Amino acid sequence: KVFGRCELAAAMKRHGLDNYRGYSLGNWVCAAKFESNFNTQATNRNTDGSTDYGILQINSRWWCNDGRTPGSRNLCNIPCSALLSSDITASVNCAKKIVSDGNGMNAWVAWRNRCKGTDVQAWIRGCRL
Template sequence: MMLKALFICVASSLLVVNDGNIIHRCTLAKILYEEDLDGFEGYSLPDWLCLAFVESNFNISKVNENVDGSFDYGIFQINSRYWCNDYQSHSENFCHVDCQELLSPNLISSIHCAKKIMSGSGGMKNWVEWKLHCLGRPLSYWMTGCHLR
């Protein structure tokens, strides 16, 4: 387990900014902390970091097309069918946001929408990848080397 944690720390350190769309793990932790996500709906910063990693590999501008024709946007891969308007398909747009805003480097729209998703039933279980790779696992190593203040 220690080897796995070391690998993830080293791998995410290499992601410092090889591409302008990748956010460093500790930079993301600081932003999430400043936006009061530590403990939000019972989830810790390591939960949020694990979510961002398994969904987008910390890629702020990731867009993924789904088999149903909807798209997932941004660092948390927020779906266009329910949460944002991509102007390509029908959307409930529960977050009242343009999907392109979820690709912004300031992350505020993504964070606000993710909080709305989290506030509904299911919490982080709404993200399949989080359920598969983060739920019930020790996650504290995601904060290794990060200084929030």
């Protein structure tokens, strides 16, 4: 599923991401746009052999099991394929664990390089929330 901007903002708020660990909703929408273009089915392969999955491009080296990243962890205890669903619950619940692990949203490279320090509130302008 390819979400609309305000559609995704409303879904993320319903799942408790607005101000989760101090990150306003616009931060999460901005990250989703540049990680996946709002597409739940997005996958990308990393140079180390791991793969990134879903709307928030969660990495199989650490967070999920895809059966082909040999010496990896599965810290969210889920198959990576669960992160590609049109239902974002699994992706959100795992993102909550990631952002609490010490580095905040700097775990998302595109957030650090394209959202951090910008006016992220613009990503939710005009949405009924």
